[PDB]
C-alpha cells in the first residue's frame, strides 16, 4: 500500500506550539535507499535531517512514506539531498534546516552530501554559512 | 499506587548552597516512556537534562515521579521535551537548562529533539544561543541496532 | 538493467581454488532490503553468509545482484534467510553453509533469523548441528539505536 | 486503542514453511516495561527471545502487542520471563525456546533471569540442559551505567 | 535507617511459582564495598550471583539490604564470597548457586574469588563440578584502568 | 585506622617544582561512595578531578584519605562535588580546577554534577567559563548497565 | 626500601576457613616486570594466577612483594611462570593452581606461557590435565597494538 | 644484517628445566609475511605457535630471525605452516605442537591453515587428533 | 613480477568522477612493511591515507603495489610517511591529503607519524592547519598486545 | 648492561629531512615504570608523547633507554612528565611537544598528568594554550579494571 515512485504530496505538518524559542529536532534515517541515475543500481544511506522550526513541524510517519517514495526512483546523491531539503522547506519554511546523507562508500569515496539553508536575511542565514563551513573541517 | 497521568505538581526543589558560582548538573534518564498521541502506541527514550542552577535545585526523587507521569500521557516528542523543560524552568528559575531527548525509532526513524534556555538578557541567553547554533555539529551514527 | 523481482537465475559459480581444504568464505551484505508480506512496508537487514565450498564458489558480484533482487519481493524474514540458503545450496553443493540475518526493528522488536546446513552424513552435518545447539549463547546488546 | 493489561490472547502464529530443518529465530525486545508487584513502580528490560520452530512461528506484530500487554501488569521479573516463555510454548509448541531478560537496576542491583525449554524426551531437551548448565560462564561487565 | 555491620537476618525469600522447571536468575551487584581486616581500608567489587531456585527465591531489596551490611564489616574477599554464598544457601536451599566477585586492585593486584554449590547427591552437584572445572578458562584482560 | 566522617584536615600538599609552566593533572577516582541525606542509603560515583597547579600540589594519599572521609557522611551529590572542589581550592590555591562526578542511578536516573573554578581576574577565570560554556556538548550514552 | 632481588621467603599464607568446598581464587597482576637473562633488557607481562585452595591461602600483600622481587631478576618467561607456580605450591599445598603469563612483544613476538598443577592422584590432577589438553583452543587475536 | 632467504639453521633451543610437568608456551607472531608461489605477491599473517615441550625450548629471538627468513621466499600457505612446524619439531622434538596461520583474507576466503603433531604413540598423539577435530568446529 | 625496491613509477591516476565536490577518499593498508635503516630489521604498520581530489584519483591497485615497493627500502617511519605523501601529491595534485602511520612496537615503543597537506592559499591549507592543531587530542589506548 | 638510574644523556637526535612542513609524531610507551619517592614502591604508566619537529628528531632506541633510565629513580608522576618533556625540549628544540602520562591506580586513585609546550612567541605556543584549555573535555571512563 506504498508509493515507491517520488511523492512529495505525502509530506505533512502539524503546528509548532512553541514559536518563542529556537529548538532543534533531528530525524535519524538509516533505511534510506534509492536508484542510481546511470547504472540503475540501488544506493543506500543514512540521512540525518535537522531543523529549527518556525511555525510548522514535519510529521514523522509522513516523513517515512516520503522517504520510501525514493525507493524506486533515480537521480544523483547531491540533488537527492537538495530535493529532500527543498520539499521540507516548501513544507515547513523553517528557521533553519540541514540534510546530511551518508552513503555506503563505493571505491573508497565516502560520498556524504551535505546541504543546509537559513531563513534569508536572518541570523539563520549566518548560522547556515557557519555550519556549512564547519562541515568540511571534520566530516 | 503511583500516578501515571501528567503531574507537574510532584516536582519539588531545595536551595542551592553554592549560588556564588556556575556549575552544571546533569540527569541521565534512560527509562523514559510515553504515548504517541494519534496512535496510543508507546514510545521510549533516553532524556539528558542539564542545567546551571540559580537559587533552586530539582530533587531527584521528584524528577523520577515527574517523568513517570508521562507513562500513560500522549504527546509528540518535540512537545514533551519543551514541556519537561518548561516545568523545570517554572520550578527552578535556572540560569541555564537543556533537555535532549533521544527516542527509539518508529517506522525506521528516530527523533532527537533538543531544547535549551538561558535567563533573558544575561550571559546565559547568549550561552543558550551558542549551544543552539553549535548543537550537534557531529551527529553520532545511528543504524537502529 | 537490474531485476528487482526475485531472481535466482542470476547466481553464478566458479571452481573452488582449494578443494583440498576447508576454508570459510565469508560474505557480508549491509544493504539487503525486501518487502514484508502483510503490510507492503520495506524491511532492512545485514546478511552474513558463510560457507565451506566443495567444488564451487558463489561469484561474489552475482550474489550482490541476487540480494538486490529482493527489493520488491514480499516475504517474512525467517523465510527469506531459508530461501537464500536454499538457492545457495542448489547452486554450489556446499560442504557447509550458514546464513545469519539482522533486521532493523519494527514495533520496537527486531528479528534475527539464523539458519545452517551441512552435507547429510558428513562431519559437516555434525558441524551444523553443533553450531545450532551453540548459536548465540551471548546475544549482543541491542537498544534500537 | 491498545491493551496494557496482560493479554496472552493477542498472540498469533503462522505456519513454518521450512519444517524439515532446524533454524534459530531471535527477537530483540529493548522496549519492555512492567510494574513491580509490591511497590507499583515501573521496571524496564531488554528481553532476548530465541527459539527453534516446529510448525508454528509467532507473528512479530502480535508479539509486540503481547509484550505491551505488560505495561500496567505487575509481576516479579523471574515470573515474567517464565510467563512469557510459557505463553509462547502454548502458542507454538516449539522444538526449543529461550527467554533471557536483562533488567535496569533498582537499589543498585539488576536482575537478569534466564529460562529455557526443549521439547521433552528429544535432543532439544538436551540442548536446554546443555545451554542451561553452560549458561553465563562469563557474565558481561556491569557498572550500572 | 540502614544496618552497616553484618546482618543475615535481613534476607527474605518468597515462593517460586515455577518450581517444575530449571531456570537461572542473576544479580549484578556493582556497588558492593567492605573493609580490609588488618588495615581497616575499604575495598570494592562487583559481585555476580547466579542461582537456580528450588522452592524459595531471594527478595531483591532484602539482598540490597544484606549486601549493605558489609559496608563497615572487616573480612577478606575470599571469605565474603563464601559467606554470601552460605547465607543465601541457608535462606534459599537452592538447586544451584554461584557467587563471583571481582574486586578493585590493591598494590596492583586484584582478587576475583569464585565459589559455587549444587544440592549434594543430585545432578546439580555435578553442575557445580563442571562449572568449577571449566571456570574461567579464558580470563579477561585486566590492566587496572 | 581510617576516619569515615568528613575531614578536610587530612588533605596535604607539596611544592610544585614546575610553576613556570601550565600543566594538567587528573585524578581518576572510581571508588568514591557517600550517604544520601534524607534516606541514609549509600551512593556511589566515579569522580574526576583535574586541576592546573600554581605553587602547591595535592598529595595523592591524602586525597584518598580525604575521599574516604565521605563514606559515612550524608550530602547531596551536587554539594559533594562543590565541597570537594572548595577544600582543594582552599588547600591548593590552584590556577584552575574542575571536579566531575558521575553517580550510579537511583529510581532510574543518575546525576552527574560538574563544577569548576579559575583564579579570579586571570586568564584561568576565562578558562573556567569557556569549559563551562562548552561542557558536555555531546553527552555519553547511559542505559544504566 | 623494598627488595627487588628474588625473594620467595616474603610469601605469607593464612588458613582457608572454607576447606569443605572447592572454590577458585584469581589474582590479576597487570604490573609484572623482570629482566631478560641474556640481554639485561626489561620485560613486562600481565600474569593471571588461579588456584583452588586446600588448607592455606596466599595473602595479597605478600604476593605483591613477591612479584616485585622479580624486578631486577633475570629469567626466561617460561621459567618465571614455573618458578612462580612452584613457590606457590610450596607455600600453599593447593588442590589446584595455574599461572598464565602474557608478555609484551620483543622483536615482534610475544610469549604466553601457561602452567598448571593438580594435587597428585586426585580429581585435581585429572583437572590439571583436562585444562592442559584444552588450553587455549581459541587463541585471542594479537596485533601488537 | 638479516637472512631473508629461507634459513632453518638459525633456529636455536635451550634446555627445559621443568621436564616433570606438562606446560604450554605460545608465541604470538603478527609480523609474518612471505611471497606467494605463483603470482609473487606478498602475503601476510598472524602465526600462533603453541607447544608443550619435552626437553628443549625454542629461543624467541632465533624464532624471529627464522620467521624473517620467509620474507623473500615463496611456497603455499598450508606447506608454509608444515614447514614451520616440522623445523620446530626437528629442533625441539616436543610432546605437542600446533601452528595456526591467519592470513589477511583475499576474496572472502579466510585461508587460515592449521597443523599439529603429538609425540607418536603417546597421549599427545590423541590430544593432537582431538585438538585438530576441535579446530574446525569454531575456527 | 613485482618491484620490492622503492618504485614511485608504478603509481597511476585517473579522472575524478566528481570534481564538482569535496568528498574524502580513504585508503586503508593493513600490510605495509619496510626496512629500518640502522639495523636492517623489518618494520610493520597500518597506513591510513585520506585525500580530497582535484582532478585526479590514485588508482587503488597501483597504490597497493606502490606500498609493497617498500618491502626492501630502508628508511625511518617519519620519513616514509612523508615520502608516501609527496609521491601522492606529485601524482595527483590533490586539494587535501593526509597520511597516518601506526607502527608495531620495537623496544616497547611504537611510532605513529601523522603528516598532512592542503593546496597553498586555499581553504584546504586552512583545513590542514586545523587538523594538525587538533590531531589526536585523545590518543587511543595502547598496551602492545 | 643497561642504565636504570636516571640518565638524560642517552638521548639521541637525527636531522628532520622534512623541515619545511609541520607533521606530528607520536610515541606510545606502555612499558614505563619508576619508583614512588617516599614509599620506594613501583609505579606504572603508559606514556603518550607527541611532538612536532623542527630540525631534530629523537631517535627511538635512545628514547627507550632514556625511559628505562627511570626504573630505579624515584619521582612523583607530575614531575616525571615535566622532566621527560624538558629533556626532550632540550634535545630537539621542537615546534610543539606534549607528554601525557596515564598511571596505574594506588589507593584506588590513578594520576594522569598532561603537560605541553609550544615554541614561545609562535603559533605553536597558541596551539599549546589551545590544546591545554581544551584538554580532556571528555575524560575516558575509568573503573580501575
Ligand atoms: C508519535 N509519537 C508521533 C507520530 N508522529 C510524530 N511526528 C513527530 N514529529 N513526532 C512524534 O513524536 C510523532
Ligand atoms: C513483516 N515482515 C512481518 C510482519 N509480521 C512478521 N512476523 C514475523 N515473525 N516475521 C516477519 O518478517 C513479519
Ligand atoms: C520489583 N519488581 C521487585 C521487588 N523485589 C523483587 N525481588 C525479586 N526477586 N524480583 C523482582 O522483580 C522484585
Ligand atoms: C584486605 N582486604 C586484604 C589484604 N590482603 C588480602 N589478601 C587476600 N588474599 N585477601 C584479602 O581480601 C586481603
Ligand atoms: C540522595 N543522595 C538524593 C536524593 N535525592 C537527591 N536529589 C538530588 N538532586 N541530589 C541528591 O544527591 C539526592
Ligand atoms: C628474554 N627474556 C628472552 C630472550 N629469548 C627468550 N626466549 C624465550 N623462549 N623466552 C624468553 O623469555 C626469552
Ligand atoms: C628504525 N627504523 C629506527 C631506529 N630508530 C628509530 N628512531 C625513530 N625515531 N624512527 C625510526 O623509524 C627508527
Ligand atoms: C608516589 N608515587 C606518590 C605518593 N603520593 C603521590 N602524590 C602525587 N601527587 N603524585 C605521586 O606520584 C605520588
Ligand atoms: Mg547502534
Ligand atoms: Mg545500539
Ligand atoms: Mg556500563
Ligand atoms: Mg581495563
Ligand atoms: Mg551502559
Ligand atoms: Mg590489540
Ligand atoms: Mg592492545
Ligand atoms: Mg576499565
From Swiss-Prot, chains A, H:
Q: How does activity depend on pH?
A: Optimum pH is 7.5.
The EC designation for this entry is 1.7.1.13
Q: What is its main location?
A: cytoplasm
Q: Does the keyword Oxidoreductase apply?
A: yes
The UniProt activity regulation field reads: Activity is strongly inhibited by Cu(2+) and Fe(3+).
Which reactions are catalysed by this chain? 7-aminomethyl-7-carbaguanine + 2 NADP(+) = 7-cyano-7-deazaguanine + 2 NADPH + 3 H(+)
Pathway stated in the Swiss-Prot or TrEMBL entry: tRNA modification; tRNA-queuosine biosynthesis
Q: How does the record describe its quaternary structure?
A: Forms an asymmetric tunnel-fold homodecamer of two head-to-head facing pentamers, harboring 10 active sites at the intersubunit interfaces.
Q: What is this protein called?
A: NADPH-dependent 7-cyano-7-deazaguanine reductase
Q: Which gene encodes it?
A: queF
UniProtKB/Swiss-Prot annotation, chains B, C, D, E, F, G, I, J:
Localization annotation: Cytoplasm
Gene Ontology process terms (BP): queuosine biosynthetic process; tRNA modification
Cofactor binding, note field = Does not require a metal cofactor.
Q: In which pathway does it act?
A: tRNA modification; tRNA-queuosine biosynthesis
Q: What does the entry list under GO cellular component?
A: cytosol
Please give the chief subcellular localization of this protein: cytoplasm
GO molecular function terms attached to this record: metal ion binding; preQ1 synthase activity
Q: Does the keyword NADP apply?
A: yes
Entry keyword Ribonucleoprotein: no
Per the entry, what this protein does is: Catalyzes the NADPH-dependent reduction of 7-cyano-7-deazaguanine (preQ0) to 7-aminomethyl-7-deazaguanine (preQ1), a late step in the queuosine pathway.
Assembly and interaction partners: Forms an asymmetric tunnel-fold homodecamer of two head-to-head facing pentamers, harboring 10 active sites at the intersubunit interfaces.
Q: Which family does it belong to?
A: Belongs to the GTP cyclohydrolase I family. QueF type 1 subfamily.
PANTHER family in alphabetical order: NADPH-DEPENDENT 7-CYANO-7-DEAZAGUANINE REDUCTASE (PTHR34354:SF1)
Query: What protein name applies here?
Result: NADPH-dependent 7-cyano-7-deazaguanine reductase
Amino acid at each position: 500500500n506504498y508509493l515507491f515512485e517520488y511523492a512529495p504530496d505525502v509530506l505533512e505538518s502539524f503546528p509548532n506550539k512553541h514559536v518563542n524559542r529556537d529548538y532543534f529536532v533531528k530525524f535519524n534515517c538509516p533505511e534510506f535507499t534509492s536508484l542510481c541515475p546511470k547504472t540503475g543500481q540501488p544506493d543506500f544511506a543514512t540521512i540525518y535531517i535537522s531543523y529549527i522550526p518556525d511555525e510548522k513541524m514535519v510529521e514523522s510517519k509522513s516523513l517515512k512514506l516520503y522517504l520510501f517514495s525514493f525507493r524506486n526512483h533515480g537521480d544523483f546523491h547531491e540533488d537527492c539531498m537538495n530535493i529532500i531539503m527543498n520539499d521540507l522547506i516548501e513544507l515547513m519554511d523553517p528557521r533553519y534546516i540541514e540534510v546530511w546523507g551518508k552513503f555506503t562508500p563505493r571505491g573508497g569515496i565516502s560520498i556524504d552530501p551535505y546541504t543546509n539553508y537559513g531563513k534569508p536575511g536572518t541570523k539563520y542565514e549566518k548560522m547556515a554559512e557557519y555550519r556549512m563551513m564547519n562541515h568540511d573541517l571534520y566530516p
